[PDB]
Write a protein that binds this ligand. Structure first.
Ligand SMILES: CC(=O)N1C[C@@H]2C[C@@H]3O[C@]2(Cc2[nH]cnc23)C1
Length: 130
């Protein structure tokens, strides 16, 4: 229905605003673009599904996310990729792990405060019906 397409357009507006607020935070700069194959030629042999905040905005605009749950699966993949690729005790690895955990926790906290649980349940019920 037209009302259902208005629901999904409100979901996209909401996801673009959360994603912009993560992308401007100086802590999260390392997550704003794909890892450069040139600088790190080993990255794509270890990490089988790379993800970054620029790809997330592209995916919103391609209508890839019909629920906030499917968006959070990509935020979780950015964070789990960084924990798996940078697991060592040295300060460089520990700093990127601390930033990855802060990106995940910040996204979840904005969604807990600003997403209406009945808006998310409506998106889930339209998705299930298709
Ligand atoms: C997001 C992530 O997990 N990354 C690991 C890489 C290792 C290190 O920070 C890089 C990018 C880079 N270029 C040169 N050294 C590096 C980003």
């Amino acid at each position: 229905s037209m009302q259902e397409e208005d629901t999904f357009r409100e979901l996209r507006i909401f996801l673009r605003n959360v994603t912009h607020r993560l992308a401007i935070d100086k802590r999260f700069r390392v997550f704003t673009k794909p890892v450069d194959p040139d600088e790190v030629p080993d990255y794509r042999t270890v990490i089988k599904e790379p993800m970054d905040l620029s790809s997330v905005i592209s995916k919103i605009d391609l209508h890839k996310y019909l629920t906030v749950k499917d968006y959070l699966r990509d935020i979780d993949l950015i964070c789990s990729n960084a924990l798996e690729y940078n697991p060592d005790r040295d300060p460089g690895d520990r700093l990127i792990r601390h930033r990855a955990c802060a990106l995940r926790d910040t996204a979840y906290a904005i969604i807990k405060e600003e997403l209406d649980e009945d808006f998310e349940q409506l998106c889930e019920e339209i998705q299930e019906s298709r």
